[PDB]
Paper text:
The interface interactions are mostly hydrogen bonds and other nonbonded contacts. The tetramers are similar and superpose with an r.m.s.d. of ∼0.5 Å. Each monomer has the extended double-Rossmann fold of NADPH-dependent SDRs with a central seven-stranded parallel β-sheet sandwiched between two pairs of three α-helices. Both the BsFolM and BcFolM structures were co-crystallized with a cofactor (NADPH). The BsFolM and BcFolM structures are in the closed conformation with ordered substrate-binding loops, as observed in protozoan pteridine reductases. Apart from this loop region, the cofactor-binding cavity is very similar in these enzymes. Furthermore, the residues involved in NADPH binding are well conserved. While the substrates of BsFolM and BcFolM are unknown, their substrate-binding cavities are large enough to accommodate the inhibitors identified by rational therapeutics discovery for human African trypanosomiasis and Chagas disease.
Numbering used by the authors:
A (entry chain A): 14 to 262
B (entry chain C): 15 to 263
C (entry chain D): 18 to 202, 211 to 263
D (entry chain B): 17 to 263
Write the structure that this text describes.
């Protein structure tokens, strides 16, 4: 009876750059109050918020280390824009490791950022969201959870766990809070990818095209706008998870 | 120019219930729409009349989808232009079970749910000019994500449509994308009084049925976000995620 | 084992033959179904019977009416308690060159016939005996690709039916499956499998007996495929 | 040959782990019985094995601490480990809304971190002219997800995910497969009468028998084309389907 965007405060983790920024600015331009979470990118976050507010939107910046104490984060956000109703678990760490050379410190960091904190923030959002309001969690995962391979060993396991948690969180938080996910494919070159590498990779996707940045915010809004959807994921990935031509064929 | 006026739609079984809801959403958004029907000709003509009298572009085409369908796409494209968006909505839903399988009904289930969607998709591909991308949306059933032994041949035929959603997406990439909607309980069934439908809905994880507007919104969501192929959204109130089975109650 | 009569479809050559001869050496009565390989089936049955077993040959075109086949077998070796749906048709087609006659044949041999034979087995199974169906599918149903379009759809449906048959036929009959990889033509392909080795014929009979001997297993599949369904280095990864 | 395939079974002193150890040892495998608390049960099992002419030893280690000497302990006594059964488990309840990360961490340490580390150490110490096998003992619930036992389930689901990616990483020389038990023996919190009612509600209406577990490890060992896969010894539990929205 009150799901208008002005009454749906959003918290986007790692929201000051790249895909997180694209989600923040999409939601803010559609009338959602947005809390831009960041850690290192505070300058960028404040600039985004100032631009939104000067344009007549409603945005704030909140700062927290997602590998430390995140127990005040939802409250820092709700103190500024009201009880968080839509949580986008976007923040990420994407470091390579391999079976045979596993460093468990890096392992722990992947699981902290991609699994522990998203679950904790979902819990905290649920606890603080008034009972007459429904909520939504959107987890940002990775297309590779739908096409497992042995590279990026601990990273992959932590993102796969976030996809597993999307189902079990959805079951646990139903009916009042829905939990869905986005699995990006090659969207913006990683730190290890030259432009040639990103382009060659995109040309090898089944759709031969990268997800465009507007598709991410549109998908969050799609999940918000269709209340029968929970426990589900859209891969914005150019078909990557459906790639199939292996050397044995 | 992917403007909706340049995206003719064919909806099979589009004169009633979910198919009608999809037709009317798309036409209200500026898509030219071909309403396929079989027994519901009067209903389909009334819909198309209302759309055309409103300044839209609609027509009605007839075919028994258990027989020859190889002229159906052309019936539509002769009226509204090359079909660019195919919604395989038509369905037959008749109970059978292991122990008393009648292969005549089995054949009808696979005709409507598998042979026809595949043939129409290929016919759409052959007639759609190479400089236009296309979309197929298959309407399946939440149960393909939570297999059970009821409605035996119906279920196998719908599961096959979900399988074909993936291999069609792989075959028709990059130019044509193939996605799916898996409905849950949307409207009461035969021998289901509204009280009965409500009691079943209350046992869904989200305790709410998909509403008809969600179907058109989902079709348009697939149309507008070009990185999605081979995927399905269950508009089902969480039904495929139900988990309280007798072994754990 | 002599209490467990077996029907193996397409049992006269290659993988079916290897399953037949394994089970026969372990004391299972076996009915060898075949169509074109009648002389080979009779030769296998003769060796089994000469060596003290109990084998027969039954004939049927599995693209047509198969409703007498289980009884043809049970008339000779007793009510069937182990059904191996091994027979297969493997012809190439693709979207955009679809021949529906071939499509119908793939679905007849891989889906309609396995289900009907399972249905007949269930109706004939004595009350005091449990049963097992083993469907022979294909590793590709665990790594979908668009090649061999109607063949793949029909094998995927057999895998779907393995689950729903298992649900429908419990507790009396368990329904499991084997997903073969490249067993017989090749040599270069195998080196590209993750295990760099092909499944060997003894593994198939060992797997059928494994399913028989462990009664808590239903609705499940083993891929004897050298890891083929786990292949992952696709063009976007290289 | 099984005489040339030394086995390490984590948590092998009781219940399912004991069933696996005794099945393998009685079939000619040298068996390193790992335990932590159940040292008396462990030494007893191995002594009965040895007295019977088998070849068993007991290695002790806390799987949540330094496990980097455990494979060495085993292989010092019975030769380089060729078959690792990651069976050790912790099964404690939590749920969304009251999650304590200390328990969460233990679930992931015993079900994911340690199985992966031990597999890593096995591959390091296995002579290159020998192939190997890892069998992860998981849980049928990874094939029928539900929101109960939240951190436990996530950690078991991770072990199932790792079964695929370890299989891809360690191929061709080492295979990685899994067993997903259903209701086998009542838990520290489940009454026998409740365990029986649960079994009566399984699709097959019977629990796995303890011999099925060792038979399954031996099945994986004897059939060299199998990797990255799991058998659920669960009486059909993961296939149960009649929920209140249908029933
Ligand atoms: N980009 C792609 O092509 C692609 C492909 C597949 C998957 N993905 C997924 O898509 C999402 C967005 O991708 P992206 O490339 O935009 O991500 P990103 O730039 O690599 O990182 C997102 C943000 O996470 C924040 N973060 C990380 N660790 C943190 C910590 N300990 N405390 C607080 N904040 C922390 C950082 O914010 P600060 O900089 O403010 O500290 C960082 O800017 C991620 O979940 C990623 O895994 C992306
Ligand atoms: N409604 C639900 O609660 C629900 C739940 C799960 C899945 N679904 C799926 O959602 C879709 C729509 O549901 P619905 O309840 O609206 O379906 P429906 O009324 O049972 O079927 C839709 C239309 O299919 C057409 N059709 C059937 N057989 C045909 C044939 N041989 N030739 C030509 N057209 C044929 C009929 O058109 P005419 O009337 O013109 O003959 C019918 O109006 C279906 O795919 C259904 O399986 C629905
Ligand atoms: N071999 C492989 O490398 C491989 C790989 C993946 C999957 N598979 C699967 O493993 C199984 C065995 O493989 P395979 O290569 O040995 O199979 P196959 O030789 O192609 O076929 C097995 C038997 O099926 C019977 N059959 C086929 N159509 C029939 C019909 N209309 N009526 C009656 N019988 C019919 C034939 O019996 P007759 O000779 O008596 O006419 C044939 O001998 C099959 O299910 C196959 O799909 C095999
Ligand atoms: N039993 C069932 O019905 C059932 C159902 C589903 C899944 N499972 C799975 O089947 C497997 C065996 O089940 P179970 O019931 O026999 O298991 P269990 O008795 O509950 O535990 C196995 C053993 O793991 C060892 N262990 C645990 N944490 C350890 C640590 N930090 N360091 C060293 N050893 C540690 C313990 O050995 P010590 O006592 O020597 O310290 C314990 O006895 C497990 O993986 C379990 O999750 C069982």
């Amino acid at each position: 009876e009150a799901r208008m965007v002005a009454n749906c405060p959003v918290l986007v983790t790692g929201g000051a750059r790249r895909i997180g920024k694209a989600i923040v600015e999409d939601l803010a331009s559609h009338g959602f109050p947005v809390a831009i979470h960041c850690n290192r990118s505070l300058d960028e976050g404040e600039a985004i918020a100032n631009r939104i507010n000067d344009s007549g939107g409603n945005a704030c910046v909140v700062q927290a280390d997602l590998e430390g104490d995140v127990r005040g984060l939802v409250k820092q956000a709700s103190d500024r824009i009201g009880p968080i109703r839509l949580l986008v678990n976007n923040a990420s760490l994407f470091q390579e490791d391999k079976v045979g050379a596993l460093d468990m410190a890096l392992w722990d960091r992947h699981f902290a950022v991609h699994l522990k904190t998203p679950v904790i923030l979902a819990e905290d959002m649920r606890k603080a969201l008034p009972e007459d309001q429904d909520g939504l969690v959107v987890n940002i995962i990775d297309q590779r959870v739908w096409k497992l391979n042995p590279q990026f060993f601990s990273y992959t396991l932590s993102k796969s766990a976030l996809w597993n948690a999307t189902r079990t969180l959805a079951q646990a938080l139903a009916p009042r809070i829905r939990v869905n996910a986005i699995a990006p494919g090659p969207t913006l070159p990683s730190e290890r990818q030259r432009p040639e590498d990103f382009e060659r990779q995109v040309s090898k996707l089944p759709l031969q095209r990268a997800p465009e940045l507007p598709e991410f915010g549109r998908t969050v809004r799609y999940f918000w706008e269709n209340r029968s959807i929970t426990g589900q994921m859209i891969a914005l990935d150019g078909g990557q998870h459906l790639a199939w031509e292996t050397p044995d064929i």
